[PDB]
Amino acid sequence: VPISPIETVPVKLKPGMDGPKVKQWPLTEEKIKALVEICTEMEKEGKISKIGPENPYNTPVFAIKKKDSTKWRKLVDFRELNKRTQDFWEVQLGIPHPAGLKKKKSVTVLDVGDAYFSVPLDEDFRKYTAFTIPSINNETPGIRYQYNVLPQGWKGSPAIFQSSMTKILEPFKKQNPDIVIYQYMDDLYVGSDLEIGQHRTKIEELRQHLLRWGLTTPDKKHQKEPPFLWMGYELHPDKWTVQPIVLPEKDSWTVNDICKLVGKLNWASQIYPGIKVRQLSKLLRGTKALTEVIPLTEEAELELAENREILKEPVHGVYYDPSKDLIAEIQKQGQGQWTYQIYQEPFKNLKTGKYARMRGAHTNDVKQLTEAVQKITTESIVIWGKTPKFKLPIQKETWETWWTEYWQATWIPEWEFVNTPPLVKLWYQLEKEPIVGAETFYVDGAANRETKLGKAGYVTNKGRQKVVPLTNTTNQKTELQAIYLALQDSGLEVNIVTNSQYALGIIQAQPDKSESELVNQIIEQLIKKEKVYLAWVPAHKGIGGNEQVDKLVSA
Amino acid sequence: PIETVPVKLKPGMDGPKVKQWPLTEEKIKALVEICTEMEKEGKISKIGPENPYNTPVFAIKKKDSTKWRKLVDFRELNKRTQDFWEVQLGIPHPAGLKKKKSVTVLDVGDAYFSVPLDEDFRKYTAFTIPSINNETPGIRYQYNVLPQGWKGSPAIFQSSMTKILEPFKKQNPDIVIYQYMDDLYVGSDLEIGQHRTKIEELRQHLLRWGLWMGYELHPDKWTVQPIVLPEKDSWTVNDIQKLVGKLNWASQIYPGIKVRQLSKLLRGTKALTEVIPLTEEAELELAENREILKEPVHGVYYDPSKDLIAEIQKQGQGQWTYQIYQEPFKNLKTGKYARMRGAHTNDVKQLTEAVQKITTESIVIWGKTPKFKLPIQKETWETWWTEYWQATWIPEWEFVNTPPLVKLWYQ
DNA sequence: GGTCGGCGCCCGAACAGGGACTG
DNA sequence: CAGTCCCTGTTCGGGCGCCG
């Protein structure tokens, strides 16, 4: 076996185990022909070698058809070898995005044919890559090979090829500094601001520099004219767009069909603005079977028809210009849904997106807006390495009131107010001092762990009083119920005294939406008020009416 | 031609495996130049995916510093080598450093690049440099010398450091020198003028051995924030309710606090804004509770085996309070920071500044870094904190959500 | 019957840590 | 007193999308 020009990567096994010893699967006669045809071909080129009985290792193997070709792909079921192979650190930290590319004069894309099979495997590790090829007869002992290159299905194959590829490209990228080479597996986006004459020369230099190591760049996958097909997009000299997305049009929807629908909708939302998958994701909750048929709700059918109409019109994105600023503008879509657009020139979107995660049981629009700003910031630094300027649908004074009074540290980068309804605001403000001339409600509530029964009420300074028996409740729900009572039976200005830290911790966060219906009713009553002053006092200390109302709601 | 000190992990623990977080363009550019230069000097060397370990890396600029500085988040690697920089070759902490009039910090991390690292341990110092928009895969390196920010670096270099400081400690036996991580703390009672002069003598004394800034401190002027009760002449029902709640919370620290006579003033179901005269028995309970807050807590002392913990409270208007403790309600030190950088505009910058000031005090007083309880959402902190970090060490932290109780630490 | 790695989203189950009440 | 439970938050397993 000749020596490969590429340096090999030393690979070990986990300390305390040995190679795989698994029996071969019964393969169809149509896949047996596809394997023996390739095994005898790779053996001629020095990619696999025969092994005798001295190799006590064996692993399954099968084949999968290639997309839009009559060629077959050889895959190995290394699930037993991967569970024993050493752990690797993947060098692929993310996926490039077309919005991060810069306008270049000349652009060239090319793909390396059979990349794994052109990169050598470690010499001391080839013994563990032993498999068997079943013949057309079940009585034939079959041929046993071992891999001399990177297999397909081994957990170390992708990381090794990516690191080996970068080492070969370093001497070329060191001699040609102004050449942008996006490297993702076997796809090589090559661009330059050099003239179109010297560009093809550098491309052929790279095709010969790669050829010196066993990497072939066939002219079949070579691309010289726009539009370029790269990473699932269509690169035009001035714009880009995703490859055509096909949504299923099933008359009867299953759970797995929704996942394929939601998956493509998220993929479309990177450039198609306004995609909403709120009501469609409400179909996946509480379900157990992937093949279970589920009918579409009225809110889900309306959300699907809107997304289809957006996909009808053609949309496109522009490229990144480092000379001009980066702008990001967010809109409040649905209840819990946000969409944003990142651009440098008005209506020339680099990319779009959506944020709709529900963090916690109680929240408001200011919290969700801050979460969205953070998601956009991290995403922006990945693609462009900088934080965009933000145009936010929230008043400057609104945000100043929130972050200065909040107890948690919070902050938004350099932003400006854009007047695009609906605006984000605070629906109610708790006073900082007790209200003069407002009735003072001392509320309390208790329950029993066993009977699940409780009381909730209040006592005021004007003699007013109420107690309500409650069934199937807890200590926490009663203390919220006692505050909900005080809000209902009070005027526009009301001071409320409680000993519940749990209830006070919820209301001070100024929520406008909650998962609890009782909280939403407390919110709706707080919005109706003009001045509300809450206050906390320790319980069981004989404080004001808080001891009198504690004794009434005792049972 | 130097012999390497053998280093091992703690038994039963693998190496660190932490992913590299996104970096800005100005940071990535600053790291490629430094790593290429350090690779040309043999300090680091490129590696491959067969190394399963990785530690995050980013860059900083110290206070009033133009030059970028490489920084590795070795917090996970330091946790997995804790038995080395303590049992084997620890550093004694001088109890007189916190008493000096002026203490200066010197970044001596460049000296660790002179000592080679044990060959078997280099596998754990691996780190990855990311690219913008994932243009290229990860450019991984590993350390061939003593890495900056590793707690094992000052331990191995300690013997070499003592022999360099011996001519200087002899001529100046009254000057205290403490080494923590990449920093050298030099404290003296000298006047501010001749103090900086002695610093320059030590700078040139370190340049002749192969080693430039300076951060001045004044531990004798460090103040604490005690718990104080309001000095009101006319008390309302709401004030007395706030006072009782605060005295009830404070009673967990000073067990001698009583609220019996004050709670008796809150018997009727009165209006919060109604004025209440303080009885004779209540006025004495308030004056006596003010004196117990002047006394020190009983049975509080530093335990060197226990970890330090720091809590920070956002008091608004650019005010931040903190408490350092090992056992709950046994606070070793309290304090309050005000008018820091970013006040009245950026909370994350102020919180970052506070953590650095607190950690600095924890190094001067006890020689340890605390574990912080940060009053911030995790995703908010993990997005912005690197934009304001100006220190060569990184403390450990967790995130808390404690709504304000009864404003115990600030009036 | 169905291979690996990377990133993204959505969900529920399992984990976990704090506060008020009870033997 | 240590034992629960009511509550909330985080972490992770697993499905899809997309790329090679």
Curated annotation (Swiss-Prot), chain A:
Q: Which gene encodes it?
A: gag-pol
Organism encoding this protein: Human immunodeficiency virus type 1 group M subtype B (isolate BH10)
Effect seen on changing residue 300 to L: 68% loss of polymerase activity. 10% loss of RNase H activity
- What protein is this chain from? Reverse transcriptase/ribonuclease H
Summarize the impact of residue 185 to L. Answer: 90% loss of polymerase activity. No loss of RNase H activity
Annotated phenotype, changing residue 411 to L: No effect on RT p66/p51 heterodimerization
Domain remarks in the Swiss-Prot or TrEMBL record: RT is structured in five subdomains: finger, palm, thumb, connection and RNase H. Within the palm subdomain, the 'primer grip' region is thought to be involved in the positioning of the primer terminus for accommodating the incoming nucleotide. The RNase H domain stabilizes the association of RT with primer-template.
Mutation effect (residue 225 to A): No effect on RNA-dependent DNA polymerase activity. No effect on RNA 5'-end and 3'-end cleavages
Where exactly is the site Essential for RT p66/p51 heterodimerization? Answer: 402, 415
